[model samples]
Target: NSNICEVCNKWGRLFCCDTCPRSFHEHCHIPSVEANKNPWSCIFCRIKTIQERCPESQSGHQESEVLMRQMLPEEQLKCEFLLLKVYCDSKSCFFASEPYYNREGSQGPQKPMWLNKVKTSLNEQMYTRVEGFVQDMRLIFHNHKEFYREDKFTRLGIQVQDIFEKNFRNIFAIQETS
Candidate 1:
């Protein structure tokens, strides 16, 4: 209805990255540019590289009691790193904004999910455990899977979801008991 943008809500000519599925305004790019940068990779546009570090934590599987409380400093730490990594990774940039594939507000039930929102929750410690973040991420990707009808963006969502889970497990490395 208005001149807004998604994949980042800044309006302007959108650029597409060939190496990865990242698509957004060139001016708003993390550090901005390619070719001139050579062997250019948008995913590497992050401020800092996220490598495996600070390897430890204590948290768990929960229904409500666990999922519904404030996160531990440990849980918060992992959550923060993971969220930052996603923004840095920037594959998440696509869904960072909203109204995907909705050319003219022409779609129904675009689930209200935003990577920024997830960050907000973490900042506010809205989850009792890390799984809240996990499920929320699943919602964004699952919605992408359902809405995109299996295309490039759908695949991107799938990829981001995989990485999110992979690092999620890697970050925690907890083996829950029955």
Candidate 2:
């Protein structure tokens, strides 16, 4: 059995923080909390105790510095292309073309669940194998353009392909020259 609520002095569900001795009513917690999903940290404990444990110096400085120094110019371009690929994939415009409206005026090719999985897998790999990744993306774009050409959107498809290729070249040129 728990004691009277540290805050309300009434009987109710109480939350306890691992870092502090105090118990608080669910409603009385300073930052608010959910039970049993994960350990709860009251505002006072988060402020007073957690802050003291991990200082800002323990964070991402080294990793970011290493990334900046180690990434080649081509690798950086690949990363930029990867960003565009993910964005186009999300919009269901894998070829970076504008989407068509449906009879109900909704957008064409809503984002797929598998695309998120692709993003997750890509992110997990952290942009390795630049040549392979770029080749795969090129294949995807070409395949989509060819497959969709017989559809009524051939003009739009051609325009999209042109725009993407142009943008890709411009980005590559700028990065290379700079």
Candidate 3:
């Protein structure tokens, strides 16, 4: 049987990147191979680590920065930003509508079976709205610093508000009519 490195095309015992699905051979990579374990980190993982450091780190930074800008200076210092700005109600029905934005629905609320149906539909619509927001932001700001700019910052704020309203209405419609 031939065992070839899937990445660099060298011949050896085949292994795959633990972080990703790409395969390679032990001899073809550095930080050489060990016996297979439940969770194994591979050499190409360095690439993922580096990419994570730049783009992934910047993504985290952008989220925090955008969130900060979303609030008034006084609001920024408050720990209940989501409750104050996004939730705004005892039921948090708006939060329930966006399954992704608030993924704790399964554990948090015991919604009606019909609400589950509504939740599913609203989740899909919210995803579409969010996808548009991401695409618009990506186009408007192709680089990291662009996220900090007034124009892109304002655009994301408006887009997020629009998405929230669109999704909120859907949630309320289901709850009211049900």
Candidate 4:
């Protein structure tokens, strides 16, 4: 309705999303959704399609300071889904590659991180606990700030981080075991 594309903020024949107030140029979406696919749902709407409830998924969630426990198998799928959601952002794709290679002499955070590294850590089961997972995820934001104070990607990270936090809360909410 803004007559602008959510992905590029420039407009012309945008694919308007039903679930969210977002508009996308077909190629701007992750998989390049075609414009002909009218009445289509946006990534945000479809991403949570399998919304299962309950807190056993959160059983292993612990204090922010704890980082030595492994992720519960039950939590694995959701974590992957969370990353999928993050990866959905075409703008966030900036983090899809390693940055250290070009930043040899450039000042950067003590630890340079990227989405691929996070994806690998998740796949390798390197994350010991949910808090640890959160730590790694948050670092992307930290590095974003450390690297770019206020720019297009920095604002993009802000939006993506909010989405991450919302789903993180829902994924680990308390459940009735009794």
Candidate 5:
């Protein structure tokens, strides 16, 4: 009886790739190597292959929009693996366009022209915004603490209530919710 591949409807043995390890008939095995050649794809290989084929890039949304316009939404969304590419592409944000490290000194790893300055500036701006918000929250909490009793929990609860009232009043507008 002639051997038949249940998968491809061709002829081969019931073999599988140790790496990707999908079962295949003997002759149906791709590359058509001799049976002695152990053809197999392990689960890792299978997953890695899938990842390679459909890599996820975690480039920030704004950076991705600016740099990787060529990538499809699905492809762009698939870019968790392409974070470096996204970072490099956003030269304005990730790195300074001007050279920072002295290439001649050669002490440690040489940073690109757009690495140190750009990243530093962007980080500072980001942190500054966050810190400003934190300061505002701190003041709000301080006011709440002054109004509430000495208990820390009561102070926190009062702070939350004050914040909710303040923001909710602004968000809904005085006339809308009232």
Candidate 6:
């Protein structure tokens, strides 16, 4: 149906915006609606209203906000790496064969040392340097093939390399002139 979700574009339980002509799947809404809420507006209408209400002088701020929303591949890698670091730090034991505890009395094994190298690259704004980091990781995995046979780890190394190769040169060239 034309009234189907602007997102999934399929027929399901849909909510039509009271303020606008747009229709959206209830689950497809960016900010999901509550069950009892009446007169809901879809995200497009809500953003339009908010943008219209903002003063003209603050329009540049909105542009910058949109720019910030678009993450470069390096930034995306840093964000994902930080999340992985946090997860590894919190659940170090799960990565180990035995029930290990660090000196701080935290259960589990300490996070892999290479994770720190990646963190260092991020901290130093060495986005281009991540290619070397991922390469070293691949070499380590190759030399110790028996110890690190997990396909997930292999894929992780590949993804890091792919992100670096795809974005690093463009970002570096842009940085050189500016």
lDDT of each: 0.59, 0.45, 0.36, 0.64, 0.35, 0.42
Alpha-carbon runs more than 4 Å astray in model 2: 1-78, 85-118, 174-178
Error of 1 at 41 (Å): 27
Output the worst ten-in-a-row residue range by lDDT, candidate 6: 91-100
lDDT-based ranking:
4, 1, 2, 6, 3, 5
lDDT of 1 at 14: 64
Model 5 C-alpha lDDT per residue in residues 96-149, reported as the tens digit of each score: 234233334233222222323323433344323322322333343344334334
Best by lDDT: 4
Question: What RMSD does each model have against the real structure?
Answer: 11.0, 15.7, 21.0, 7.8, 24.1, 13.7
lDDT of 2 at 128: 52
**lDDT: worst 10-residue window of model 1:** 47-56
**What tens digits encode model 3's per-residue C-alpha lDDT throughout 79-169?**
1211122322223332233232122222322322222232333324432332333232233223222323453443543444454444333
For candidate 6, write residues 37-120 as lDDT tens digits: 587765556544544675452332222232243335533343333223232222322221222233342233233334345444
lDDT of 1 by residue, 48-128 (tens): 222323212234433344334457664566566566556655587776875545634235445668777776677676887
Give me the displacement of residue 144 in model 2, in angstroms. 1.8
Winning model by TM-score = 4
Q: Candidate 3, which segments miss by more than 4 Å at Cα? A: 1-3, 7-12, 56-178
Model 6 segments more than 4 A misplaced: 61-178
Question: How many clashes in candidate 3?
Answer: 0
TM-scores for the candidates: 0.55, 0.34, 0.25, 0.56, 0.20, 0.34
- Determine which window of 10 residues in candidate 3 has minimal summed lDDT: 75-84
Q: Where in model 4 is the C-alpha error above 4 Å?
A: 1-70, 100-106, 150-153, 174-178
lDDT for 43 in candidate 2 is 51
